[PDB]
Design an enzyme around this catalytic site. Structure first.
Site: not given
Ligand SMILES: NC(=O)C1=CN([C@@H]2O[C@H](COP(=O)(O)OP(=O)(O)OC[C@H]3O[C@@H](n4cnc5c(N)ncnc54)[C@H](OP(=O)(O)O)[C@@H]3O)[C@@H](O)[C@H]2O)C=CC1
Ligand SMILES: Cc1nc(N)nc(N)c1OCCCOc1cc(Cl)c(Cl)cc1Cl
Ligand SMILES: NC(=O)C1=CN([C@@H]2O[C@H](COP(=O)(O)OP(=O)(O)OC[C@H]3O[C@@H](n4cnc5c(N)ncnc54)[C@H](OP(=O)(O)O)[C@@H]3O)[C@@H](O)[C@H]2O)C=CC1
Ligand SMILES: Cc1nc(N)nc(N)c1OCCCOc1cc(Cl)c(Cl)cc1Cl
Lengths: 538, 529
Positions: A38, A94, A96, A118, A153, A157, A159, A312, A334, A360, A420, A440, A443, A451
Site C-alpha cells: 500500500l 492522518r 495518509n 495527535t 486508507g 485505518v 485494519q 515453434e 509435434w 506451416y 488447425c 478451423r 480444442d 494458440n
Molecule cells: N495505495 C493505497 O490504496 C493507499 C496507500 N496509503 C499509504 O499508506 C501509508 C500510510 O498508512 P499508515 O501508516 O497505516 O497510516 P494511516 O493513514 O493509517 O494513519 C494512521 C494514523 O491515523 C490516525 N488514526 C488511525 N486510527 C485512529 C483512531 N481511530 N483514532 C484516532 N486516530 C486514528 C492516527 O493519527 P495520529 O498519528 O495523528 O494519532 C494514526 O497514527 C502511506 O504510505 C500512504 O501513502 C494510504 C491510503 C491508501
Molecule cells: C491512490 C489511491 N488509489 C486507490 N485505488 N485507492 C486509494 N485509497 C488511493 O489513495 C487515496 C489517498 C491518497 O491520495 C494521494 C496520494 C498521493 Cl501520494 C498522491 Cl501523490 C496523490 C493522491 Cl490523491
C-alpha cells in the site's frame, strides 16, 4: 440492520506486489494476498499510475441524486427520525492525509474527514472534519448529508475498519508490478468477503492493472413488459459446480472471453464422437478479441509455459518442417505427429520419422513448391508469403489482401496433419496493426490458450519489424470443442478468478522477422493460478 | 384518456390477394375470412397471443391502481366483438385466466352468465374499468371493434403480428396513420406452419440491487466519433427492441458510420472501415434477403452455377446479362493487373477453377481441365455424407500460388461446414466487404449455396455465419445508408429449391424460387447520375 449497510461505508485501495525471497521463486505461488503493498516511506510505492488515480477520483466523486431520497429515508429510520450539491464523504488516516500533495487537498468535490489523535482542527487550514475515534465518524455520518462514504486508507485505518465489520465493499485495484513496500493492506478473510466483479485489464505508466470489487458475505418501464413478450420462446451439468463463476456480477476481464466459451460449450454443446471413441462437446463459430496495446493475453486461471510455443513460432518462421529441431530443444508439441506409426496411419509410408511434410513453415516460406524432404533447400521456390505480407504492411498498408494462409489444398494429404490455424489477416490504421486468425478446429481445453499466445506474439513480431504498434488480436473459432474428460478440469478452472494479465517485451534491436531468437522475448509479471492436468488420469 | 387505463390492441394480419408491386405497413391487413381466421393453424402466433394477453406483473400493479382511482389473483381484461366471440372454439371459452368481455348489442346477461362480462357500447367499458381490478386491457378485436377503438383514440400500444403469406380475406385491419402511431420494436423472424412471421409493436406518438447499478458506472470510468449527426438516425434510434436479424447488418453499418477509421483506398475514393464482425442467420427460420431496399437474385444464382461448373470464362455470364465480373475482365483492367497475355474476360484461376481444380496449372479459359487438380467441391460433399463430424470440411478459394494470375484475388476466402443431428451450418470468411453494395449480395449467395449443399446431402440447413475481415463503407454511400437505416425491416422471405435436384451439378436457374419477398423500394447507393 448493521452499521455498514445503513451508512454505506466502503473501502477503496490500490495494491501492488511486494519483494519476497529468491530461494525457489522461479516457481512461486500466487493468491489474493499477492497484491498487498500500500505504501512505502509514508508515500505510495510507485511514481504515478494515473489510470488508478482517474478511477479513484471517479468512484469517490460519483453520486446519484435520485437514489439519495431512499438512503435519506433508510438512515433516518435507523436513528429514529422522520424524513448545495450532494457529495460523498472520504475518510483518511492522518499519515495518509500527509502523504497527499497540497494542490490536491482537500479532495475536490468530496467531504474530507481525517482520523487523528495527535492533531486537532486548529492544526488545519483546510475545509476538513477532524475526528479522534471511529465512533465519532458514525456520529458525524448521522448528522451530515452524503451519498456514500469511502475509507481512503491508511493500513491502520483499513485494519480497524475491517475488524469493526464496517466495510460493505472493497474497491480494489490490483497493480501488476513489484515495488518496495513497508506498509500493507490487511489479508482479506475469504469467508467474510467474496469477489463479485472484475474489470477489463489496462496498461498505465508501464504496468497492467485491473479493478475488482469485494462484497461482504452473508454467512420509463412500460417497455420492460415488452421485453418479456419478445422472450416467449441441453446438458444439465450441475449448478453448484459453477458456484464462484456464476456468483460474479461483472465478468469484464478479457480471460472471460475464453472462459465463457467453455461455459457455453458445456451448457449448450453438441455431443459427438471421433471415429475412435473419445467424446467431445462442440459448437460452431465464436470470436474473441484482445487488445494487445493494453496487456498480453496469457491465461491466468492456469499455468502456461511459453518457451515451447515460442520455439515453434521461430521454427515456422525459418520455414522448417523438421521435427528433430524442436525435440533437440526439448519441445514435444509435434512429437506425436512425427512417429513411424502416425505417419504410416497417415499413408506417408515414405516419410522419414519426424519429417512433418509441407506444413506451416513450408507454406509460409514456399507455398506451391514441390515438397521433397525436410532437409532439402527450398530457397526461391514457392511463394514467400511471410515476406510479401511484411512488404504489403510496409508499402501498401490500406491493402485488403494482407493474408498469410497455411491451408494449401494441394499439399493437405502430404502434411502430417492439415493446419488447425487456417489463416491470418492483417489490418493497419494510424500506425497500429491488428490481426484476425481463423482457426478451423479448436480444442478449447489445451490447444486454445497456447494458440492465443502464439498469434499474440506473432502480431508483436510483425508490428515491430514494420515499425507499428500492436492493436487488436481477433481469434475466430470454427469448430470449437471440449474433450469430455477435460470437463472436470475445466470445471475447476472456470471457478478461478483471473489475475491481471502480464506483459510481453521484445528486444527492440530486432528489425527483420527472420532475426528473432528465444532470448529476445520476456514475459513480465505473469501472475497465475496453479498448473492443471486436463485429464485427471495422468 | 387511453394513457391511464392502459388499453392496447393486439392483432395478426396476413397479406391479401390483390388482378411492380408496392409495399408498406398496409401490406399486412388481412384479419379474417368467412367468420373464421384466413389461415389454418399458425401455432406460434397463438402462443404469442396467449403469452401476452395472460401475462401480469403484480409488483407493478400498485402504481396503476394508484393512477386509475385518482383519476376517477390479478388478471388482464380481454375485449372482443360479437362475431369475434362466436368464432372462438368453445373448448377455449372462457379464455383461461382472463377477464372475458364481449362488446355486442343483440344479446345480454339474459343469455350468458355474470362471471363473463357483456357490455352495451364503446364508452360503457371505461365505466366498467373503474369497477375493475386488472393489469392491462387488450382489444382482441374483430374488424369493427378495432376500427371504432382506433377511431375514438383509445389505443396506446398495438401488438401486431405480421404473417408473411397471402390468404383470401373478407375483413381487414384499418390503415394505421403513421403520424398517429409509430413502431418502436420489431422481433426476431420465425417460421411457423410453412410461413414466416414477426411481431412488431406500435406506440402512440407524443405529438401534443442498486449497489451494482453504481458499480456499472465505475467500470465505465474510462469510456471514450465521426461527422455523422444524431437527428438523421431518428427512426433507427427511436427503436427500443431491434431483434430482427436484418439488424445484424444495419447495426454494422451504424457501427462503421459512428466508429469507422477514415481511409482513402485502392483508387482514392474515401471509405470508413473497421476490422472483424460476425453475423449469424438461422436458415431453418428464414431466407435472409434484405428487406430495407430491393434486391435482385438472378445474377448471383448464375454466378454460383458458373462457379459450380468450374467456369472461368466471363463471356458465359455476359451472354446472360450477368455483368458482375465485367469490369474485372476488360483489356484495361487486366493490363493493370500485369496480365498482358490474358484474353479479355478470361478471369484466370478464380473460384470455379479453385473449387474444381485447385492446384492444376491454369492455361486459358477454354482448356479441358477434367481430372486436373483437386476437386474440392466433390471432396466436401463426400466428407459431409460419409464423415459428417470431420473438422476439415472446408472449401478454399484463396490459392496463394495462383493469386497473381487471378483477375483479382477472391473476396470470399473460404467456407467451413459443420454437421450435427441432420443439420448443416456454414461459415464464410470474407477478407474485404463493401458493406453498402457487396455484402447484401454476399449474404444471399452463401445462404443459397448452403441450401444447395444441404439438399444434395440430405440435411436441413441450420446457420449461415458470415465472418467479415476488412469491413468498409464507401464514403459516397453514406447518404443512402442513412436513408436505409431508418427503414423498418419486414419479415424475411423463404427460399424454395426444386426438391428433385439431388446432385450439386444439376441445379438450373429455374430450380430456385424466392417466396413472399416483401421489401422496401430500390435504392441506388451512388445517388449521382
Ligand atoms: N495505495 C493505497 O490504496 C493507499 C496507500 N496509503 C499509504 O499508506 C501509508 C500510510 O498508512 P499508515 O501508516 O497505516 O497510516 P494511516 O493513514 O493509517 O494513519 C494512521 C494514523 O491515523 C490516525 N488514526 C488511525 N486510527 C485512529 C483512531 N481511530 N483514532 C484516532 N486516530 C486514528 C492516527 O493519527 P495520529 O498519528 O495523528 O494519532 C494514526 O497514527 C502511506 O504510505 C500512504 O501513502 C494510504 C491510503 C491508501
Ligand atoms: C491512490 C489511491 N488509489 C486507490 N485505488 N485507492 C486509494 N485509497 C488511493 O489513495 C487515496 C489517498 C491518497 O491520495 C494521494 C496520494 C498521493 Cl501520494 C498522491 Cl501523490 C496523490 C493522491 Cl490523491
Ligand atoms: N387476425 C386477428 O388479429 C383477428 C381476427 N378476427 C376475425 O375477425 C372477424 C370478425 O370481424 P368483424 O365482424 O368485422 O368485427 P367484430 O368481431 O368486432 O364484430 C362486430 C360486432 O361487434 C358488435 N359491435 C360493434 N361495434 C359495437 C359498438 N359500438 N357497441 C356494441 N357492440 C358493437 C356488433 O355486434 P352485434 O350484432 O351484437 O350488435 C357487431 O356486429 C372474424 O372472422 C374473426 O375470425 C378477430 C379478432 C382478431
Ligand atoms: C389469434 C390472434 N392472434 C393475435 N396476435 N391477435 C389476435 N387478436 C388474435 O385473435 C384472437 C381472437 C380470435 O381467436 C380465435 C379465432 C379462431 Cl377462428 C380460432 Cl380457431 C381460435 C381463436 Cl383463438
Amino acid at each position: 440492520e448493521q452499521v455498514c449497510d445503513v451508512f454505506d461505508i466502503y473501502a477503496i485501495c490500490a495494491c501492488c506486489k511486494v519483494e519476497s525471497k529468491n530461494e525457489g521463486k522461479k516457481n512461486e505461488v500466487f493468491n489474493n494476498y499477492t497484491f498487498r503493498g500500500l505504501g512505502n516511506k509514508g508515500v505510495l510505492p510507485w511514481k504515478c499510475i494515473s489510470l488508478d488515480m482517474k478511477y479513484f477520483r471517479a468512484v469517490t466523486t460519483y453520486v446519484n441524486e435520485s437514489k439519495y431520497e431512499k438512503l435519506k429515508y433508510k438512515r433516518c429510520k435507523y436513528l429514529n427520525k422522520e424524513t448545495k450539491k450532494l457529495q460523498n464523504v472520504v475518510v483518511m488516516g492522518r499519515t495518509n492525509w500527509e502523504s497527499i500533495p497540497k494542490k490536491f487537498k482537500p479532495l475536490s468535490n468530496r467531504i474530507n474527514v481525517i482520523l487523528s489523535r495527535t492533531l486537532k482542527k486548529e492544526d488545519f487550514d483546510e475545509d476538513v472534519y477532524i475526528i479522534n475515534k471511529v465512533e465519532d465518524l458514525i456520529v458525524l455520518l448521522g448528522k451530515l448529508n452524503y451519498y456514500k462514504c469511502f475509507i481512503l486508507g491508511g493500513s491502520v485505518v483499513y485494519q480497524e475498519f475491517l475488524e469493526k465489520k464496517l466495510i460493505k465493499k472493497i474497491y480494489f485495484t490490483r497493480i501488476n508490478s513489484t515495488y518496495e513496500c513497508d506498509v500493507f493492506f490487511p489479508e482479506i478473510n475469504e469467508n467474510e468477503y467474496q469477489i463479485i466483479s472484475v474489470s477489463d485489464v489496462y496498461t498505465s505508466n508501464n504496468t497492467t492493472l485491473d479493478f475488482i470489487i469485494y462484497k461482504k458475505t452473508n454467512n420509463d418501464d412500460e417497455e420492460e413488459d415488452d421485453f418479456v413478450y419478445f422472450n416467449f420462446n441441453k446438458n444439465s451439468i450441475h449448478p453448484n459446480d459453477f458456484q464462484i463463476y456464476n456468483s460474479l456480477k461483472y465478468k469484464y476481464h478479457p480471460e472471460y472471453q475464453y472462459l465463457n466459451i467453455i461455459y457455453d460449450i458445456m451448457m449448450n454443446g453438441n455431443k459427438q464422437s471421433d471415429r475412435t471413441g473419445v467424446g467431445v462437446l462442440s459448437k460452431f463459430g465464436y470470436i474473441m478479441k484482445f487488445d494487445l496495446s493494453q496487456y498480453f493475453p496469457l491465461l491466468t486461471t492456469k499455468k502456461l509455459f511459453l518457451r515451447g510455443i515460442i520455439e515453434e513460432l521461430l521454427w515456422f518462421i525459418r520455414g522448417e518442417t523438421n521435427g528433430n529441431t524442436l525435440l533437440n530443444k526439448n519441445v514435444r508439441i509435434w512429437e506425436a505427429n512425427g512417429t513411424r506409426e502416425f505417419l504410416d496411419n497417415r499413408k506417408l509410408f515414405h516419410r522419414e520419422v519426424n519429417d512433418l511434410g509441407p506444413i506451416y513453415g513450408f507454406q509460409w516460406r514456399h507455398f506451391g513448391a514441390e515438397y521433397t524432404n525436410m532437409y532439402d533447400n527450398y530457397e526461391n521456390k514457392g511463394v514467400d508469403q511471410l515476406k510479401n505480407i511484411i512488404n504489403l504492411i510496409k508499402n501498401d498498408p490500406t491493402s485488403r489482401r494482407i493474408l498469410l494462409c497455411a491451408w494449401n489444398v494441394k499439399d493437405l494429404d502430404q502434411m502430417a496433419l492439415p493446419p488447425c490455424h487456417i489463416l491470418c489477416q492483417f489490418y493497419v490504421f494510424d500506425g497500429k496493426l491488428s490481426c484476425i486468425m481463423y482457426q478451423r478446429s479448436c480444442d478449447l481445453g489445451l490447444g486454445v490458450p497456447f494458440n492465443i499466445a502464439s498469434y499474440s506474439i506473432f502480431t508483436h513480431m510483425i508490428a515491430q519489424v514494420c515499425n507499428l504498434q500492436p492493436a487488436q488480436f481477433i481469434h475466430v473459432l470454427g469448430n470449437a470443442h471440449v474433450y469430455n474428460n477435460h470437463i472436470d478440469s475445466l470445471k475447476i478452472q472456470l471457478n478461478r478468478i483471473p489475475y491481471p494479465f502480464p506483459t510481453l517485451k521484445l528486444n527492440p534491436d530486432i528489425k527483420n522477422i527472420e532475426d528473432f531468437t528465444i532470448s529476445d522475448f520476456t514475459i513480465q509479471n505473469y501472475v497465475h493460478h496453479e498448473k492443471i492436468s486436463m485429464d485427471m488420469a495422468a
